Amino acid sequence: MIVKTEEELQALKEIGYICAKVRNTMQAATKPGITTKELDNIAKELFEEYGAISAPIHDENFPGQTCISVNEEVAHGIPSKRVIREGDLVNIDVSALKNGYYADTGISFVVGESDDPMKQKVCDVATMAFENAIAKVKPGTKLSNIGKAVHNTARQNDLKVIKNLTGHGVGLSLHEAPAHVLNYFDPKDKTLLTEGMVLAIEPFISSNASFVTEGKNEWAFETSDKSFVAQIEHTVIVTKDGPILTTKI
């Protein structure tokens, strides 16, 4: 959406805080021996406490409060009896609405230690890619600068991006204009960012695969080659004085 009023701004900040709090609480609770359903139950309780509703449940009839994707799963994983293990690469993606307004945020991290440093590397590079993307965000700037920055960051680190997962506008719905915030540069795109525009920026950095495919069920996205993939996602408001992240707290 485009923010035009202080009441809209406040509503976005409220739901962003709630999603950040949930994301942080879930991440802190992720340890070997917890199941992904038990982690999802944290979101259930917190959404109730804060008067928010799961966007996956509301918008998509997704069977889970949140999306929790482990190892071979990159996105849209269904919380279940799956147990977290030492060295897992976990993505927790929290999106919700309150009073009609939305936020969307996500983080990938390594549980304990993996024997392969590549798991942490993709996380480190996803973080850098996010930072580099938002350093580009201002009214009048090209949307495509975001994907250009993300892919350049990946290349600087000998990594790839997931080309077929994107960010998106957010605000009155989970997904709205701009339709797609790519992870790479499209030289033909003339779309600009504008003052008050709200978008979810979510680089996906991969150790090998450049795309995801349908996974073990009708929701999860995976890589057949079991690439290590990390996401960092925030909801961002484009302002004259710099990007405001509703989901950073």
Ligand X SMILES: CSCC[C@H](N)C(O)(O)c1ccccn1
DSSP class per residue in 96-162: EEETTEEEEEEEEEE-S--S-THHHHHHHHHHHHHHHHHTT--TT-BTHHHHHHHHHHHHHTT-EE-
Q: Is 202 annotated as a binding residue?
A: yes
Nearest approach in angstroms of CB 202 to ligand X is 5
Tell me whether residue 93 is annotated as binding.
yes
Residue 202 contacts ligand X per CB under 6 A: yes
Structure tokens at 187: 């030289």
Let me know how long the chain is: 249
Question: How many C-beta neighbours within 10 Å does residue 15 have?
Answer: 30
In the list 75, 128, 134, 137, the residue contacting ligand X (rule: CB under 6 A) is: 75
Query: Where does this chain touch ligand X (CB under 6 A) — which range of 12-20, 53-61, 110-118, 185-193?
Result: 53-61
Which member of 8, 93, 151, 244 binds Co ion (CB under 5 A)? Answer: 93
Q: Which stretch binds ligand X (CB under 6 A): 56-64, 108-116, 120-128, 152-160?
A: 56-64
Which CA distances in Å does 102 have to 121, 207, 229, 238? Answer: 30, 31, 25, 16
Calpha distance 59→151 (Å, rounded)? 30
Contact letters (x/-) for Co ion, 175-204, by CB under 5 A?
Answer: -------------------------x----
**165: contact with ligand X by CB under 6 A:** yes
Q: Which residues bind ligand X (CB under 6 A)?
A: 55-56, 59-60, 62, 67, 75, 93, 95, 104, 106, 165, 174, 200, 202, 233
